[PDB]
Amino acid sequence: DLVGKLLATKATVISTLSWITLFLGFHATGLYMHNDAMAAFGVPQKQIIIEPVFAEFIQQVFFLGTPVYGLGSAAVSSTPTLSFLPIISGGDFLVHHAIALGLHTTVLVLIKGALDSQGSYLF
Amino acid sequence: AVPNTPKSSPDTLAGNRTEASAVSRPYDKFNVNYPLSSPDQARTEVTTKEIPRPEDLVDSPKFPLFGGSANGYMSKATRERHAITWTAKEETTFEMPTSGWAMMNKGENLCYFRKKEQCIALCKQLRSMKINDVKIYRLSKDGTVTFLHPSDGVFPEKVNKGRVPVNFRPFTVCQNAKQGELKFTEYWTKPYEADALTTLFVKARVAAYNDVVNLFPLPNPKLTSGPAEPTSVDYDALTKEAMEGQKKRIEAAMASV
Amino acid sequence: AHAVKIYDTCIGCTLCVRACPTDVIEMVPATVNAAKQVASTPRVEDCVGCKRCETACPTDFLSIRVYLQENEETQYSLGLDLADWS
Amino acid sequence: RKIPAGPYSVSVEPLRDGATNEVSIVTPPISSEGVQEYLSLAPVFFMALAIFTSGFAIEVLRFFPDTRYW
Amino acid sequence: IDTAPVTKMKNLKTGTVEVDQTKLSVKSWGHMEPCGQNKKFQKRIKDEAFKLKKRQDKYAKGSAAYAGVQEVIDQAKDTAKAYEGRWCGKKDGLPRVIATGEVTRGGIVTPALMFLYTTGWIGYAGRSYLLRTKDAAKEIKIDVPLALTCMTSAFAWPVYSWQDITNGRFVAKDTEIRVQRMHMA
Amino acid sequence: DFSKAAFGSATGLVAKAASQTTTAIWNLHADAHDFSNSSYLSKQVFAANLAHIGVVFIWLSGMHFHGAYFSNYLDWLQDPSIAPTAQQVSNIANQSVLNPIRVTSGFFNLWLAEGITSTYQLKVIAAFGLIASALCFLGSYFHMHSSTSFTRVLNTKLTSLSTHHLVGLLGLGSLAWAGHLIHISLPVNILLNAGVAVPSPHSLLSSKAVATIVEQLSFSALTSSDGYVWQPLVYSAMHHFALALVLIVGSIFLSTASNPLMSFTVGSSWHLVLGVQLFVTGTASVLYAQMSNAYPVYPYLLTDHPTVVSLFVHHMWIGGFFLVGAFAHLSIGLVRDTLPQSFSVVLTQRDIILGHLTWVVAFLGVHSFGLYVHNDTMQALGRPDDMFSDNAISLLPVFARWSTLTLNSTGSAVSVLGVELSTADFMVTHIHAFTIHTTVLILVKGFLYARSSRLVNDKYKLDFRYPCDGPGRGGTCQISPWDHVFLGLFWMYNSISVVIFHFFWEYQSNLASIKASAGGSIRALASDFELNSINTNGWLRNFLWSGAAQVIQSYGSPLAAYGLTFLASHFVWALSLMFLFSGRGYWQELIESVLWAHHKLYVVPHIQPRALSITSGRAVGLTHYLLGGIGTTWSFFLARIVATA
Ligand code: CLA
Ligand code: CLA
Ligand code: CLA
Ligand code: CLA
Ligand code: CLA
Ligand SMILES: CC1=C(C/C=C(\C)CCC[C@H](C)CCC[C@H](C)CCCC(C)C)C(=O)c2ccccc2C1=O
Ligand code: SF4
Ligand code: SF4
Predict the structure, then answer these.
(1) Cα atoms found within 13 Å of the Cα of residue F9, Cβ hemisphere only
(2) Cα(first)–Cα(last) distance of chain F, in Å?
(3) Of these four, A15, A66, D69, F137, which has the most CB atoms within 10 Å of its CB?
(4) Coil vs helix vs strand at E34
């Protein structure tokens, strides 16, 4: 069944989750350390600030009623509605990648333990 | 001495240690033949005359050259004792299992310990020093002595006749039934205690469940007080065709093997 | 009492017997291995659960398995030295 | 070697007669094949690779400071 | 007594979501502008130059420390001139990295390709060494000629790897490797 | 041959399939210096010691080389108030902000105490240090490969070794240093303090210089020899001369005919000697850390506050580490000896000693931290008069405030050293005592329960370093003497961290108080430490959070390196948490999945990937924990004391 298929290829699931977590942690930590070094060395301009252009695109096209970033769309709503959606910037990219790293690592540990409850080569 | 040791007897301090262990830990019991594996295994019997309780021995000649230590058993706080009776060829030094050092007597030797693990460690040390006939006994609260370790006279490292296998499971470790397969049975949480027949039966049952093309619907019970529902399906014809399917499937499966 | 089991894969090493600090494992005759001997555990009540027997078993996986049962602890299984329950 | 001396010793046996005019070279009897084998060890080889990579990065950063050509 | 800055949503009841094609480019985005005319970026550069000059003034003219700080100042000036072509917001002035996929100043496609080629080179060199040195001895004891042969021969990794993938010499059949089947699948 | 045997460990690792795992590599590293018992054990130990001496000589030569070439030592000589920097930093990446790094090792003050005035002298010392390191390496080679077995030095020739160390090494070194002081370190400091130029040091050994210019042997010389930077060197010279005399006289007036190592094997004898030597070196390091700020001995040392703080903290850490290693090697020697009957009284009073120490630790912990928590609660509840302070229930350390005695021609140190103590000093001293007692409890427990215990009765068969005995008996993890040293290292970290926190806050409080101005003479309490180091909140606010401003606002300044090391230390410390909280099995299963991923792509490494063993994981976690905590304190202290002093 569904669970049997998940168990049979549990090695693939655990390995790919491990790769995702390794990539996310490596890059988030490395970019944060690079920004730390640049700010420490009095060169804040040379930080790696990857603009969260995908979330900005979603926000501008689907949520925002005024041109805040201008990417994807620039139309202004004639009768906008109000809410408390924050306006994102460069740091939010790294923070969301940290969030993704945390979620993926938690899922990795939980899935790995659940699927190895059926047994590992050590047990 | 009253400050050195409590003034009351070990039995007085024990209170109702028995009749409470039977209540607090009803699972904690020995099998009918504790030191042995089969009922017809000689079962050599010893008494307090042979191995007396330590509180009845003062400056016994069989005691080794031991100076006493704080690491020994709890007199007046525990009543169970384990004794070692080994015969030496010469007077040499050995490590006590409770740390410190004692010197063996030329002939008979006798030590008392609380845990059997200490006695077995001392036996390992002595056998490493070329000593046979290391006999380990257990002293109970009332003084009943149980002979242990070379229970049938032959050390467990050497195979001996009359020893029935115990806790032997006739398959591989991972051939035990899974907990889900043994659900709602007495072996649900302990699949390693199930019988070989039970494990094989449930491992075949899970396979039987996964063949719904031939699995039987098992009609609903008649619980309502009203008349039987006419329905539109004949359970008798279904049962007959299921008998035919079972017969043909068994024939084909046995032809395969 | 931590249940200890012996399986067909046992090859009569006697290493599990020598590794037991409480004389639980015991060598019985059998006709399943070339050694014509198989470990048995007739004194499980003395098993502390140290799993030294599992450390000394050379088979691909443990021909002797110690299943810890924390809901059935015993003064012999807990290795009590200063408290007596008998 | 009745006198207890460590393995791989360049020491003559201390049980000698009257003063001997002998040549006892105190230098390790190393081998060119052995030295090349030792420098090919995984720790040595990979630490040398790491040092080479780090120095290459150092020189690239020195002669091309920052990411000016991004 | 006030709340957080309230943002205005699009009451998009028209039943269609319009994505402007002309806004799919960095040059058309109203929140990022080139660093050359970014006033905040220019102020950052001026502050950096002023701090470097202040640090230089501590050491007397002609000293080695003076020359070192002067070289630092020249490096900062050249870096600023290079970064004038980058894209840096409108209120921060810090140059940004555009990870959309557009090939722009400070983009990601070229660095991604360079890194992927380099690390595929590394991985293929290691894999080739392990395939041609199926021995733990040659793993602990690196066969330096063969190791460097594999390292310099892995330059063709992107095509050799795909050829092996499509020809079955790259991946291993699941029935031939140690896969976890302890549940007796 | 020898080159072939250099990688002999790796050849043996690859020879057997059982050693073709990463665990074998980690064992090869862990068992690197664990010189096994053999006929050449003493040769190996002595050669390793000589090699380490050569390494330290390399370090000293490098430090003198940096002083000669990459330091403003001459400018510091012309003006001691300037920042001592002895590490140039090249313009790579963007690190140019921290180009002059203020060195706090005190080498400038040391060299000034040695009469060094020219960088040429530092170059010569660096060259001679390299020469000495080369000689030490040659000697270590020789002893390992061609020399005596050295097996008689701890049992048979212990009298000769001890007598040589007493007379020759110690006494003659002290006498030679006294001669150096009197002849070139006093006159050079005289001519520098007076500003009358310094000749070549050898010209002071002319019998026509101030040695015979005036024969007056008291504090009277040309013009006015009233330099108080110079008197500590005079006292040091007198101390060294007296110490040399007393050592030489007492060595020949001592029995020394008692070697307690007759009953121990050579390996266990070496381990016990190492343990007692580590104890002595650690307590000496702690004593020097106290005496560095207790008594001024180096020129312009107390003025350089970062140097004082660094010396104190570094030597406290080294003393704590060596004190822990003392018990570590005592445990190793006890557990690895065949018949260690010498410790019979303590192995038979095992439970008595351990339980009394347990009660002492419990009493001290509850009392000290309850004083702290009670002060926290009373201050939170707005009850300052119910706290433990000077304006409240006063825990005055009366035993501290008395050293009066018959004079008999003495002075200075006949008192409490001119410092008054208060409730905060009492409470923090009891915290120090409790933490020291707990570290000693763990270490002594590891020593005593090393061969046997009530839980496991054959722990001597398990050697010194084992992960556990199994999950039986309820669980027997961390019973090994190694694991007791592992926990004692954490408790030493806690103890020394609190000690250095107490010292640093007291030092900053005294610096602020002496910065009254001149007119301000009622310090009331003020004394930020004395007024606030009575609560855990007081510490957390007025010491950690208060002084962290320097280390967290260091970006763009030369202390940005301290800020970055602060962050990296936090990172390493949380990684330690990762290693310490987790277990080997999980990581093994994760590595199994990753290795399946590898095998799927025909990668298949043969050195089978195994996760770190239980003891290896604990050791890695402890190493990262110590590194992170000590680095955080290092960055914090250095940034705070350099920015503000
Ligand atoms: C700061 C503390 C810390 C850190 C860094 C990690 C890091 C990690 N944990 Mg972890 N963990 C921690 C605390 C921490 N843990 C604690 C306290 C617990 C509770 C016990 C756990 C419990 C836990 C579990 C149960 C699991 C992890 C896993 C992981 C890994 C996830 C993959 C990843 O992000 O790779 C990124 C790796 C890092 C960020 C480590 C630092 C690497 C460098 C220094 C940073 C990058 C620098 C630069 C880019 C490299 C330069 C390259 C070249 C120039 C030389 C990773 C190694 C999972 C795992 O192993 O899956 C793979 C997993 O299953 N951890
Ligand atoms: C031949 C070398 C080699 C190759 C081809 C691979 C290939 C792979 N590894 Mg891997 N790995 C290696 C060495 C190698 N690894 C080493 C030495 C370690 C120990 C640190 C690991 C630890 C490791 C983990 C923990 C994980 C992978 C994963 C992966 C897969 C995804 C790629 C990835 O995340 O890489 C990232 C690689 C690393 C994080 C470690 C790289 C360390 C160095 C750079 C690699 C060594 C190269 C080698 C020494 C070259 C020598 C050549 C010379 C002898 C000629 C991929 C199949 C992931 C996976 O299963 O995803 C499906 C995963 O979770 N690997
Ligand atoms: C990790 C090891 C380590 C490191 C890196 C340092 C580093 C440093 N130490 Mg140090 N130290 C250590 C361990 C260490 N120490 C230990 C374990 C001790 C205890 C013995 C000391 C004791 C010590 C003293 C006493 C002094 C230093 C000093 C110094 C600094 C100058 C170094 C120098 O060339 O002076 C070389 C050192 C000296 C010239 C002092 C020699 C004093 C002698 C050797 C003391 C002998 C005591 C011994 C027990 C006598 C036996 C008495 C018995 C007969 C009754 C430097 C920062 C000096 C300093 O702060 O200067 C700024 C300084 O005065 N250290
Ligand atoms: C005079 C000092 C001294 C000496 C000679 C020894 C000697 C020995 N110790 Mg020992 N020890 C000491 C002090 C000393 N110790 C102290 C002070 C402690 C308490 C911290 C200990 C704690 C200790 C334990 C717990 C154990 C030993 C063991 C051993 C033996 C094997 C050591 C080995 O293989 O390590 C090989 C060398 C290493 C592992 C070094 C690796 C680096 C370490 C782990 C961390 C260093 C981090 C570094 C400082 C920071 C990096 C810089 C940063 C900027 C990145 C050997 C007899 C072991 C044994 O079995 O003894 C028989 C053992 O289990 N020791
Ligand atoms: C362990 C450390 C410690 C100590 C010494 C104190 C001390 C005190 N607290 Mg306190 N407190 C603490 C921790 C501590 N606190 C902690 C951790 C908290 C947080 C929960 C509080 C919260 C707290 C509150 C909320 C209050 C106090 C108050 C008080 C005071 C009165 C307490 C009282 O009635 O005494 C009771 C004392 C005893 C019953 C006697 C016990 C001690 C005896 C003498 C031991 C004798 C042993 C004997 C010598 C053994 C040998 C015998 C043999 C020779 C025969 C007193 C100054 C009160 C206050 O405001 O007063 C200022 C108050 O209202 N405390
Ligand atoms: C993570 C972890 C492992 C896995 C650790 C392994 C497999 C060690 C291998 C890690 C490699 C060697 C890291 C190499 C160094 C890093 C790349 C970082 C240093 C270099 C950077 C700073 C650039 C254990 O084996 C373990 C065992 C017992 C308790 C806890 C743990 C535990 O927490
Ligand atoms: S060690 Fe394992 S295989 Fe050998 S006799 Fe014991 S149970 Fe059987
Ligand atoms: S948890 Fe680890 S250390 Fe503790 S008993 Fe189990 S295996 Fe041993």
Answers:
(1) 14
(2) 58
(3) A15
(4) strand
